[PDB]
Subunit: 105 residues, 5 copies
Amino acid sequence: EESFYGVTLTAESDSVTWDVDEDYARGQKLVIKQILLGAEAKENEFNVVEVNTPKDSVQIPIAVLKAGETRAVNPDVEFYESKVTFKLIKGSGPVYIHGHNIKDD
Amino acid sequence: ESFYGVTLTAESDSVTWDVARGQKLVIKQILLGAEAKENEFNVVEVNTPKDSVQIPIAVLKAGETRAVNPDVEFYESKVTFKLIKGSGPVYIHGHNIK
Amino acid sequence: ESFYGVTLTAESDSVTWDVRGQKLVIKQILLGAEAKENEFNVVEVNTPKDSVQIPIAVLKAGETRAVNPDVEFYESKVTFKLIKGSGPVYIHGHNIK
Amino acid sequence: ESFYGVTLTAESDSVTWDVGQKLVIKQILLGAEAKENEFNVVEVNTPKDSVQIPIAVLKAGETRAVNPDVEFYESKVTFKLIKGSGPVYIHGHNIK
Amino acid sequence: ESFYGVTLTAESDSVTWDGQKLVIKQILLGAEAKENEFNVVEVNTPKDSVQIPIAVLKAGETRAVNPDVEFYESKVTFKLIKGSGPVYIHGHNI
Ligand SMILES: [Mg+2]
Ligand SMILES: [Mg+2]
């Protein structure tokens, strides 16, 4: 009951929302395993991804990357039955978000 | 269960988690903010009375260590996280699961 | 049930997995010691399931030696391609049913 | 279960874990006060499985932390700071 | 059921593990490892016909890797094909 999750964020397309079948609580969970900075990212430019979840008054950066210092982070965080939006609030990317898209429990 | 995300700064250096049965807080990542002062050590200390422990779980510094992934858990416990060194910001990520 | 270990290089820049309940877990992507200093090595994962195509590893001698995607692919073929760099790059994981 | 957090320093270089009990070591972290460029090595000793070996090699300026994610189902386990003055922090948990 | 911890060096550049399974959690470079020297650990598992580096370490760049790979019912041999180490391999057998 899983599917690979892989989305890309850029200055031009800075947001991605996960909301698998809006309102229906069947145990769906999104697990974010890795957030990776693209090879083309300008050296020394901070790239920050912020995660947003209304369900928990949540708004906080989950990744701070910079070519030359931090190429990737492995949050291994999860979001359960909730609408989650990832936004590139700093930098032009690209930034890739990888994880597990769990359909139910 | 629910995502856990709190921010610590010089202006607000402490947060507490106090729920109960079967509840556990898993701390997956502690990340240093982009604005953090270069070469400034930022230390997050966890305090858990129940398990008689007060110890740093993150030592970060722009230019050396941007993040740590403790992957530690606090089962059926009240827990306080404090930024005891540095001005931050520092982000603590995890989730609660019963 | 079986260890998965494949090598990608400029000469052999692509590998495909066709294995049903069969699943492929990718645990680590590692840059070889002979990889050129300062050369970006990018591995792209591709799968017909959900039309997937995205880099899953960006490596570079002197900056990033390895990544741990810890991602999985279920009942579907998966192709890994070294779209940038000459490697060698190693992909590690396992196949389980 | 219970959280496991212990500190090792030159002045207090060893800690022993005693009592299906399993000790899982998740992270070994180098303290901010650790001398720059100083190697700090934590050795583990688990007789039940016959193994004395370093499980962490840290150094300010190079490696701030390691995530062993190793477990000892075994009885008693001793961690010792065999190199360096620390402080070094060991985090994990005891699971019944 | 048991902690696995072995050391590889130029002098002792081989280790053999011969329901049984071996999970490799961490491969760590020793403090005495020569600065800037590449240390490569190759795993060889006959059952799946794989011989491939599982760790590439170097003092000053990469102190450790966390493969988190597993080997199901099979003989496994780890060889330090490059470098003098010491290199430590940690995990557990089930
Ligand atoms: Mg924008
Ligand atoms: Mg303070």
